[PDB]
Amino acid sequence: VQLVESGGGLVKPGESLRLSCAVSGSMFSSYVMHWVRQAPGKGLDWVSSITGGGNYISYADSVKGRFIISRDNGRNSLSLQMSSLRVDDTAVYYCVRGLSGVMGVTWFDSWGQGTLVTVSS
């Protein structure tokens, strides 16, 4: 049930990259996945979401359209194309694998390791 991902490092601002998640669950077809981020100093924020097949893609308000999130159900993997890179984008990113609620809401169950992406200089 533990999530492991990789793809961090130092990246110049402006250019796009691919950040991938390698979830190794056994029933990774119904669980709703999201990505969060956090930086030293300011508090932890939200980045992106994805539900099931991939027809209800939802985004944050701090970033919209810049980040492209997709996932391969057969390969049990996730990815984001990081089109634009501003100064605020440097953060430790966490994959997160949450379950649907008693109504519909998600409470961010067992988190991934967290990969650091730096964009400064």
The answer to the question of residue 32 lying near another protein (CB under 8 A) is: yes
Question: Would you state the torsion angle of the CA atoms of residues 121, 11, 91, 7, taken in this order, to the nearest 10 degrees?
Answer: -160
DSSP state of 95: E
The answer to the question of residue 14 lying near another protein (CB under 8 A) is: no
For β-strands 77-82 and 67-72, DSSP reports them as antiparallel
Complex with another protein: residue 15 or 109, whichever CB lies closer: 109
Q: Which of 81, 89, 95, 107 is nearest to 34 (CA)?
A: 95
The answer to the question of residue 45 lying near another protein (CB under 8 A) is: yes
Binding mask 50-69 for another protein (x = CB under 8 A): -xxxxxx-xxxxx-------
What is the binding site for another protein (CB under 8 A)?
26-27, 29-30, 32, 34, 36, 42-46, 49, 51-56, 58-62, 73, 94, 99-114
